[PDB]
Design a protein around this ligand. Structure first.
Ligand SMILES: *[C@](=O)([C]([N]C(=O)[C]1[C][C][C]N1C(=O)[C]([N]C(=O)C1=[C][C]=C(C([O])=O)[C]=[C]1)[C]([C])[C])[C]([C])[C])C(F)(F)F
Ligand SMILES: [Ca+2]
Length: 240
């Protein structure tokens, strides 16, 4: 997150860290959202890769023992069947991960609230991106979980030529584009939390940014629209 602030440790309890094995160690690669005690929602591009993964729930600081983490294996990966490798603009950038165990819930570990199917946010709706991604274009991961306020940019504006044009589809959410705040590498797969009728729900799965940088004016961060995939999600869970 470029232009982030440190999240309180109990603000975003559905955020997870998706990590890959690196020798003797584990490295954060993507975010995700805990959606069942044994299921995580992330981006397809995070997991359509030759890596071995684990999930950390109750994670705040990637570099320090928080005393709240649960570390769990990834047992099954279900990428959306219409995802195309290395092709974010074609959409379908979503995957579900069945965890090797069911995590226990607490103020640091909660299921993400998902929107009802079909729900679309009014332009300029209040949302926060969260994650440990780069804090500057070509920078480094955050240590502590970051948040940034990214108001939505509706499809009509976002798909206009001054914004993303035809790159953006109606199965995506755009948010931000102020030139200061954005997602950046390592935020991918995490939640976009939007406040509607007094409740935060996870409306987006972080997907991609501009070829010119992370924080680029009129190039909002782009997310998979969760509410377009409710039936898909439910079918995967029910079949696995
Ligand atoms: C995420 O944390 C990360 N996402 C990305 O880096 C994604 C994954 C593929 C590359 N990518 C990008 O965001 C890149 N953009 C594009 O590849 C792209 C831009 C424009 C168009 C188009 O048609 O208009 C098509 C593709 C940029 C250049 C890095 C963050 C940024 C959410 C992780 F991948 F894990 F790093
Ligand atoms: Ca930690």
């Amino acid at each position: 997150v470029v232009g982030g602030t440190e999240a309180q440790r109990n603000s975003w309890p559905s955020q997870i860290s998706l990590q890959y094995r690196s020798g003797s160690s584990w490295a954060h690669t993507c975010g995700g959202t805990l959606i069942r005690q044994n299921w995580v929602m992330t981006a397809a591009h995070c997991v359509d890769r030759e890596l071995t993964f684990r999930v950390v729930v109750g994670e705040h600081n990637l570099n320090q023992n928080d005393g709240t983490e649960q570390y769990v294996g990834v047992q099954k990966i279900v990428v959306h069947p219409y995802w195309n490798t290395d092709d974010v603009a074609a959409g379908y950038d979503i995957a579900l991960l069945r965890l090797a165990q069911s995590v226990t819930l607490n103020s640091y570990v909660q299921l993400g609230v998902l929107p009802r199917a079909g729900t679309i946010l009014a332009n300029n709706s209040p949302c926060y991106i969260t994650g440990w991604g780069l804090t500057r274009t070509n920078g480094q991961l955050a240590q502590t979980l970051q948040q940034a306020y990214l108001p939505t940019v509706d499809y009509a504006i976002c798909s206009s030529s001054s914004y993303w044009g035809s790159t953006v589809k109606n199965s995506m959410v755009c948010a931000g584009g102020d030139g200061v705040r954005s997602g950046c590498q390592g935020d991918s797969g995490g939640p976009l939390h939007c406040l509607v009728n007094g409740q935060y729900a996870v409306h987006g799965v972080t997907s991609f940014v501009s070829r010119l940088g992370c924080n680029v004016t009129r190039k909002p961060t782009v997310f998979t629209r969760v509410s377009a995939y409710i039936s898909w999600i439910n079918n995967v869970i029910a079949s696995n």
